[PDB]
Structures are given as C-alpha cells and as structure tokens.
Amino acid sequence: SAAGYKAGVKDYKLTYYTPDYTPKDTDLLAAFRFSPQPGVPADEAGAAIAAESSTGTWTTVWTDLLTDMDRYKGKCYHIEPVQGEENSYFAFIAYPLDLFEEGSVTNILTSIVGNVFGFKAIRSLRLEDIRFPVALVKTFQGPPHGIQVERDLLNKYGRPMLGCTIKPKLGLSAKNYGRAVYECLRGGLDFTKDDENINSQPFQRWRDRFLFVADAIHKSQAETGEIKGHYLNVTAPTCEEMMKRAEFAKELGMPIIMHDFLTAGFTANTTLAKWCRDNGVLLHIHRAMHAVIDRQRNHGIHFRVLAKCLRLSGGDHLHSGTVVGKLEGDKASTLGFVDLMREDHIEADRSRGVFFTQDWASMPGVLPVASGGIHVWHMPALVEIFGDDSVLQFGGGTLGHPWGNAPGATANRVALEACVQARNEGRDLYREGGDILREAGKWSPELAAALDLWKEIKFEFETMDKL
C-alpha cells in the first residue's frame, strides 16, 4: 500500500535505478553521457538524473504516498561505460508519457534538462538523444509546410535550392539592403536572407527593409521568370513585435520569413510556426546560439536533439551545417541528424550518433540548410552529402565575387543552374561536381574568377626513387 512514511535521505538508486525495466512505446527515452564525481557510483548518479528530472528530490517526502509513484517516476533502466574513456557512462532513462504537456517542447526540455546539469555529484552531463514517442509526436503541429509542400508552392524541383546571406552583417541601410538583394536574386539564386542579427536597428529599421526587399523580389522575379524569396527576419524583443513583423511580411505577399528559434525561444517559435501554417508563410529557422550548447561532447545537448525539438515546434528550413565550411560539423553525425529532420523513420545507428529509432508518424520533414564559409569548389561535396532536398547558401561566396556584386551573383547563379542541369541529366554531383563547375567556368568568366579565388591549400610535392 502506501508503504509508510519514513522521513530522511535515501539513495536515489533505491527508487530510480530500474535495470529490469523494459520501456513502453509511449515512454519518452533519453540518452545522457555523464561523468560522476569521485566517490559517486554510476548507478546512483544515473538514478539521481532520473529522479531530479521527473518526480524526485533530495530527501523523502510524505506526499509521494498520495499518488502512484511507480506510474510517474523516471526510470534509469540502463547504464553502460563509454568504451575507451575513463569515468564516462551512458545512462538511458525512460519517462512516462503522462509527465509532459502536449505540444510543448518548452515543457519537455524543462524536465529533461531543467536542473540535472548543475548537480554537484555530477562533473559533466550531455544529452545525446531523445526518443519522442509517436503518441507525443502527434500532439505537435510540426513544420508549417515541410519539404514537399514547399517545393510545390515555389515550383522548385529537381535540385538543391540556393540562398545567400547579405553582407556586411550589420551597417547597410534598407535601400542598400534591397539593392544587394535584387542583384543577388537576378543572378540566379532562389533566396536571399537577413543575417540572424538583422532585426531592427538604428541604421536599418525593420519595416523599411521589408518594404525595399519586397521591391527587389518583384523586380528580380519579373526579370528571371523564376520564383524568388528573401527570408525576412521577424526575430523580435517580444511576442507582440514578432507578430507585428510577421504580419507585415504577409501583407507584402512575402513567401518566407525567418526566426532565430533559440535566442527568441521555443515558446515564441511555436507561436510563429502555428501562425505560419494559418497564413501560408514558409518559415526558415536559424540556429543562432546552438554551439554554446552543442559543441563540446562532455557537456551540453547534442544538436540532433535540438533538430528534433525544432521539427516538433515547427520550421520549414533548419540550418544543418556544411561539414566543409567555416563552422564545425562532424560528417557522420550530420548525416544522422539530416535523416532525423527529413525522414519518417530512422533506425538506431550509433555510428551516426542515432541512439534511438525515431518515428515521426508522417510529420513533414524539414529542409536542411548548408551555410557558412562555403564557395563554388565545395559544390560537388555539398550536393553529394545533402542531395536535392537541401538549401545551399553562399553569403561571402556570392557578394565576394573580385569584380563585385553583379558578377558575383552571376557566378553563383550559373554554378547552381549547371549543377541542377547535370543532376537532372544523371551526372553524379559528388564524383563529377568539380568537373561540372570547370565546364561552366569555360564559358562563364565570372564563374571562372570565383572558382580561382576560393579554390583552397593545394597540394602538390613529388618522384626521385629511380633505379
């Protein structure tokens, strides 16, 4: 029965370490990587994590006996040492479906990563993966549109889409912003975008940018006969401002906006994702601040958890990294979470960092966006890695084209169309990408100039050893 109240401190592992537990399909599962403080056994540390992220605290309370603790408690059901590493373990913890508010990524994170990372008895803690049960996945809207609906809205089929962040990051007036946008889009890029930190500032107020950018989109679309877009950044100080900015973009008939989901937050993001669905505006998601959280493997949250959370909260695009560009991205890991954000069913595969099999119950996929420090020479690798359902973005790699902006834009537009044509013809972008680019460089001087500039250390060394 209610088994008697005995006040006092007990070991967490007496209640919360359950090595004989078999997870239900409605359980939310979490994989943590942890190092206990000297003198703290791994099973007690794993139990403490399970306890303080579900139902438990540091001493025994009588109120437990008013309810059914077995039904509600988090259960550390497996611990394994990390092969080859001293004092590092994986704990696998099951959480009942009942613990979570439906449709709330905010609530899920508050439990799983709310307090346990600062526990004295633990040196370091990193959340590697979460299996979201299908019953919970169905309480979320997910992407406002998702990959296939987006291609259909934009009439964009048969190859990766191309984007470009306007530079300098900050400092340009609204009119000069639209100027740079027009010249980029007219040259063959599908999208341009606000920098993540372009919101509304003294040098460029948001409503002016929206106005001038809309003009640039109309002119370039009229000239090229292809659908153009520019991710207008609605990231704002408050929910009210965010919505005010989203609203004007809709008023201008803009097809796509962007949002910094982490610096604004999941509560504002989930609001925006619902609005986007109701108003037919595509939502590009920038991951600003993620590396504060996900870079080091001993402590934090791995990006693949953040990617899963974003697909639930809602976003049509999400930056995925480049692997080859100026910012860090492990290839095996990247291939793993690109599958997690695109596909409907992803088998567990530890070699790609996927700890749990994840089902999405037909929740739309999110387009991965490869951006940051990439140029034309990267193109065959990018097409190889990400395939057709991706957006490849070149900020400096467009606006930094030796002859200026318009030739820089043409270089990127030609390079893109050459790759799409080749892909459609059956050429392998991974194996033949460099060649496809060299070919096009033969008749495009401005592409040739760009290929030369950003080719980059070659190596090349030497033969002696003669008989």
């Binding site: 005995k6 007990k10 070991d11 007496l14 000297p38 003198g39």
Partner: protein
C-alpha cells in the same frame, strides 16, 4: 620542525579523514538504496573512525562488500580533491591567521 615526521603524520590523519568521509558517502548511498544496511553500518561504525585502516579491517570481517565500497570511495575522493588541498590549507591558514590579528591585535 621535523618536517618528514610532520608530513607523515599529517598524511595519516588525512588518509583517515578521507576514510571517514567515504564512510559518510556510502552511508548516504545506502540510506537511499538499502535502509536496514545503512542502519547496520551506522551502528557498527559509531566510535570506530579514529584510525581509517583499523576501521576498514574491522569492517572486512563483518561486511567485506562494504569495506571494499569504502576503499573505492576514499580512493575516488582523494583522486578528485587531493591536488586542491595544498592551496586551500596554505591560503586558509594565512587568511585565518590574518583574520585573528584583525579582530584582536
């Protein structure tokens, strides 16, 4: 100031304080995981913690399982904290000394 002797004696005192603190840890662990065994260990240990080696050997006869647990915890504690004790003891003494002169002298 027989320094080899003082260090030797300070080290033995340290070793036997860390043993006592490993005891507190497993006692607390057991309070959660095995309440009756926590009680046994507490009652057994009362007035036995002056010499850490004598303590562990007494515990080996009754509960070799627990002895081995304490041995591991004291070892772990030392490995985590030992390197920070020289600063903490030197600057603690220097600050404590100097607080006593400020209050009185």
């Amino acid at each position: 100031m027989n320094l080899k002797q003082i260090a030797k004696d300070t080290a033995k005192t340290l070793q036997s304080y860390l043993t006592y603190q490993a005891l507190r840890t497993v006692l607390a662990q057991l309070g959660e995981t095995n309440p009756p065994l926590a009680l046994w260990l507490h009652n057994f240990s009362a007035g036995k913690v002056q010499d850490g080696e004598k303590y562990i050997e007494e515990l080996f006869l009754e509960k070799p399982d627990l002895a081995l647990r304490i041995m591991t915890v004291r070892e772990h504690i030392a490995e985590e904290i030992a390197e920070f004790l020289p600063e903490m003891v030197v600057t603690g003494i220097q600050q404590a000394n100097m607080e006593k002169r400020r209050q009185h002298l």
